[PDB]
Write an enzyme that holds these catalytic residues in place. Structure first.
Site, PDB file in Angstrom:
ATOM      1  N   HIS A 194      36.162  42.638  48.837  1.00  0.00           N
ATOM      2  CA  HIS A 194      36.764  43.537  48.614  1.00  0.00           C
ATOM      3  C   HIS A 194      36.207  44.883  47.781  1.00  0.00           C
ATOM      4  O   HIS A 194      36.015  46.137  47.802  1.00  0.00           O
ATOM      5  CB  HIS A 194      38.211  43.548  48.110  1.00  0.00           C
ATOM      6  CG  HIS A 194      38.071  43.312  46.401  1.00  0.00           C
ATOM      7  ND1 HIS A 194      37.381  41.550  46.339  1.00  0.00           N
ATOM      8  CD2 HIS A 194      38.073  44.079  45.378  1.00  0.00           C
ATOM      9  CE1 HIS A 194      37.178  42.128  44.284  1.00  0.00           C
ATOM     10  NE2 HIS A 194      37.784  43.537  43.912  1.00  0.00           N
ATOM     11  N   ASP A 195      34.589  44.360  47.323  1.00  0.00           N
ATOM     12  CA  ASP A 195      34.181  45.315  46.175  1.00  0.00           C
ATOM     13  C   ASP A 195      32.972  44.969  46.653  1.00  0.00           C
ATOM     14  O   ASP A 195      31.562  45.340  45.943  1.00  0.00           O
ATOM     15  CB  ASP A 195      34.134  45.093  45.035  1.00  0.00           C
ATOM     16  CG  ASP A 195      35.258  45.133  43.963  1.00  0.00           C
ATOM     17  OD1 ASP A 195      35.895  46.081  44.653  1.00  0.00           O
ATOM     18  OD2 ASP A 195      36.172  45.085  42.982  1.00  0.00           O
ATOM     19  N   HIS A 246      31.127  44.673  39.063  1.00  0.00           N
ATOM     20  CA  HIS A 246      31.406  44.781  40.260  1.00  0.00           C
ATOM     21  C   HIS A 246      30.413  43.739  41.366  1.00  0.00           C
ATOM     22  O   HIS A 246      29.797  44.202  41.565  1.00  0.00           O
ATOM     23  CB  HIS A 246      31.705  45.746  40.334  1.00  0.00           C
ATOM     24  CG  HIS A 246      32.564  46.900  40.464  1.00  0.00           C
ATOM     25  ND1 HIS A 246      33.530  47.247  39.056  1.00  0.00           N
ATOM     26  CD2 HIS A 246      34.844  46.112  40.349  1.00  0.00           C
ATOM     27  CE1 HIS A 246      34.815  47.268  39.189  1.00  0.00           C
ATOM     28  NE2 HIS A 246      35.268  47.085  39.279  1.00  0.00           N
ATOM     29  N   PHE A 278      45.101  49.042  28.847  1.00  0.00           N
ATOM     30  CA  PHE A 278      45.174  48.548  30.100  1.00  0.00           C
ATOM     31  C   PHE A 278      46.674  47.269  30.293  1.00  0.00           C
ATOM     32  O   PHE A 278      47.436  47.700  31.215  1.00  0.00           O
ATOM     33  CB  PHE A 278      44.381  47.816  30.574  1.00  0.00           C
ATOM     34  CG  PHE A 278      43.559  47.018  31.447  1.00  0.00           C
ATOM     35  CD1 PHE A 278      43.853  48.032  32.636  1.00  0.00           C
ATOM     36  CD2 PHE A 278      43.212  46.447  32.062  1.00  0.00           C
ATOM     37  CE1 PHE A 278      43.429  47.374  34.355  1.00  0.00           C
ATOM     38  CE2 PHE A 278      42.153  45.727  33.214  1.00  0.00           C
ATOM     39  CZ  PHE A 278      42.769  46.068  34.605  1.00  0.00           C
ATOM     40  N   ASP A 314      42.914  41.030  41.670  1.00  0.00           N
ATOM     41  CA  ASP A 314      42.357  42.023  40.726  1.00  0.00           C
ATOM     42  C   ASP A 314      42.503  42.255  39.158  1.00  0.00           C
ATOM     43  O   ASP A 314      41.302  42.904  39.297  1.00  0.00           O
ATOM     44  CB  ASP A 314      41.978  43.262  42.078  1.00  0.00           C
ATOM     45  CG  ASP A 314      40.537  44.462  42.507  1.00  0.00           C
ATOM     46  OD1 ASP A 314      39.488  43.772  41.586  1.00  0.00           O
ATOM     47  OD2 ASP A 314      40.893  45.301  42.702  1.00  0.00           O
ATOM     48  N   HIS A 324      33.127  38.833  40.202  1.00  0.00           N
ATOM     49  CA  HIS A 324      33.947  39.519  40.446  1.00  0.00           C
ATOM     50  C   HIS A 324      34.834  39.035  41.833  1.00  0.00           C
ATOM     51  O   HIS A 324      35.739  38.491  41.862  1.00  0.00           O
ATOM     52  CB  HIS A 324      33.577  40.661  40.711  1.00  0.00           C
ATOM     53  CG  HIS A 324      35.408  41.416  40.443  1.00  0.00           C
ATOM     54  ND1 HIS A 324      36.250  41.145  40.098  1.00  0.00           N
ATOM     55  CD2 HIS A 324      35.198  42.646  41.301  1.00  0.00           C
ATOM     56  CE1 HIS A 324      37.224  42.357  40.235  1.00  0.00           C
ATOM     57  NE2 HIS A 324      36.743  42.790  41.496  1.00  0.00           N
ATOM     58  N   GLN A 374      42.322  47.989  26.292  1.00  0.00           N
ATOM     59  CA  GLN A 374      42.484  46.842  26.393  1.00  0.00           C
ATOM     60  C   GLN A 374      44.061  46.595  25.974  1.00  0.00           C
ATOM     61  O   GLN A 374      44.753  45.898  27.085  1.00  0.00           O
ATOM     62  CB  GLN A 374      41.579  45.012  26.345  1.00  0.00           C
ATOM     63  CG  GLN A 374      41.062  44.687  26.816  1.00  0.00           C
ATOM     64  CD  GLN A 374      40.246  44.681  27.931  1.00  0.00           C
ATOM     65  OE1 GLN A 374      41.394  44.558  28.914  1.00  0.00           O
ATOM     66  NE2 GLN A 374      39.497  45.635  28.887  1.00  0.00           N
ATOM     67  N   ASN A 380      42.102  39.706  35.035  1.00  0.00           N
ATOM     68  CA  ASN A 380      41.366  38.877  34.096  1.00  0.00           C
ATOM     69  C   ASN A 380      42.242  38.837  32.635  1.00  0.00           C
ATOM     70  O   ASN A 380      41.834  37.806  32.474  1.00  0.00           O
ATOM     71  CB  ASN A 380      40.334  40.388  33.788  1.00  0.00           C
ATOM     72  CG  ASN A 380      39.679  40.678  34.974  1.00  0.00           C
ATOM     73  OD1 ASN A 380      38.890  39.356  35.796  1.00  0.00           O
ATOM     74  ND2 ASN A 380      38.898  42.035  34.557  1.00  0.00           N
TER      75      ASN A 380
END
Ligand SMILES: COc1ccc(C2=NN(C3CCN(c4nc(N)nc5ccccc45)CC3)C(=O)[C@@H]3CC=CC[C@H]23)cc1OC
Ligand SMILES: COc1ccc(C2=NN(C3CCN(c4nc(N)nc5ccccc45)CC3)C(=O)[C@@H]3CC=CC[C@H]23)cc1OC
Ligand SMILES: [Mg+2]
Ligand SMILES: [Zn+2]
EC number: 3.1.4.53
Length: 325
Positions: free
Chosen positions: A113-114, A73, A285, A231, A77, A282, A234
């Site tokens: 946003h982060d 973050h 996810f 977001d 990113h 992963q 990735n």
């Protein structure tokens, strides 16, 4: 260098831009260089009368509020999410759907946003009784903070990039940005995805034709999902980029786990470096969050995202194939 940077930035409109290389070549300023490039490309400085050095001042200030000691973050990113949003906004199926103000809002929201992310989760902030969790009543703690900081930075010297918007424009933009950033909290994901699915089904039964988003609610929903896809992009990227993102998120999560194991709190999911399979996480996810979202997005913009979905599936097989015994 520098001429090499200009050359890498020619890929700004492509999925899979070497964002880590841009970060190295710009002296760790990928957010500033990428945003500037995008703004010039989209003629947003002329359209909204944003003076160029005001924009650069804001961007450098924003970038400095992202922490370089946070593995995932950070400013890289942020840059990645901006650039990904930029590519999604340019998808053929959305051509001429969104106004310039909407575009501006989405790109701005991605950049901020982060911002000021501490590298730990909302639940960790809540559990430690952090001042942030107490200010925001345990609700979308980080995302409320990212917004507050992003907007506050416009008040620093020569940072007000929206100075030339009309009042009505500022109001609209402000609301959109807020709606978009708050939708990046993963606690909102299932409701967002349900709405997107509903919209997709509605489209299939209503029209083979072009996309018609005729009220704020539908328009903002698409923008929310778009930045949320960016977001969560990735695992849709070229595997070489994806693996670096995986390394970074696991370093951040394991560090949170180290801070949780001391203090005897429950170790959050995927944060135990003694008990965690990165590869398995992963796959999970992808299977439970990223693929359902991207498949639905791909449906909305069919067939624009087919190659992104193919990459996702290949990437899933890669991690699936390397899960330990
Ligand atoms: C004398 O006449 C010019 C001199 C320099 C530039 C320069 N233009 N720019 C950008 C600056 C921001 N933009 C606009 N902003 C705002 N508020 N309003 C605008 C209105 C109409 C068109 C563009 C803008 C986009 C272009 C650079 O980046 C150059 C390189 C470095 C510095 C300034 C240069 C433009 C001129 O006339 C348009
Ligand atoms: C590159 O690889 C990743 C990048 C980002 C994230 C991100 N992960 N998340 C959450 C996602 C859902 N999680 C799961 N929780 C629970 N209980 N069960 C689950 C079961 C199956 C899958 C996920 C979960 C917790 C973490 C954020 O909140 C980040 C901030 C914002 C967006 C995504 C980020 C994860 C990555 O790899 C795991
Ligand atoms: Mg976030
Ligand atoms: Zn993010």
């Amino acid at each position: 260098q520098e001429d090499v940077l200009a050359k890498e930035l020619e890929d700004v409109n492509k999925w899979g831009l070497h964002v880590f290389r841009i970060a190295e070549l710009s002296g760790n300023r990928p957010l500033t260089v990428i945003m500037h490039t995008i703004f010039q490309e989209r003629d947003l400085l002329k359209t909204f009368k944003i003076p160029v050095d005001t924009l650069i001042t804001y961007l450098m200030t924003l970038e400095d509020h992202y922490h370089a000691d946070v593995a995932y973050h950070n400013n890289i990113h942020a840059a990645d999410v901006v650039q990904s949003t930029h590519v999604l906004l340019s998808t053929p199926a959305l051509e001429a759907v969104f106004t310039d103000l909407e575009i501006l809002a989405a790109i701005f929201a991605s950049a901020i946003h982060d911002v000021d992310h501490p590298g730990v989760s909302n639940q960790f902030l809540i559990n430690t009784n952090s001042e942030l969790a107490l200010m925001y009543n345990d609700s979308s703690v980080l995302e409320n903070h990212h917004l507050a900081v992003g907007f506050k930075l416009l008040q620093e010297e020569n940072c007000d990039i929206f100075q030339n918007l009309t009042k009505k424009q500022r109001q609209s933009l402000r609301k959109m940005v807020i709606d978009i950033v708050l939708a990046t909290d993963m606690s909102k994901h299932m409701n967002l995805l349900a709405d997107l699915k509903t919209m997709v089904e509605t489209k299939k039964v209503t029209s083979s034709g072009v996309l018609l988003l005729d009220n704020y609610s539908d328009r903002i929903q698409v923008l929310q999902n778009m930045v949320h896809c960016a977001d969560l992009s990735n695992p849709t990227k070229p595997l070489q980029l994806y693996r670096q993102w995986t390394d970074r998120i696991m370093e951040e999560f394991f560090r949170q786990g180290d801070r949780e194991r001391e203090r005897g709190m429950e170790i959050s999911p995927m944060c135990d470096k003694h008990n965690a399979s990165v590869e398995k996480s992963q796959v999970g996810f992808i299977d439970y969050i990223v693929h359902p979202l991207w498949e639905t997005w791909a449906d909305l913009v069919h067939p624009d995202a087919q190659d992104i979905l193919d990459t996702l599936e290949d990437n899933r097989e890669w991690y699936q194939s390397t899960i330990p015994q």
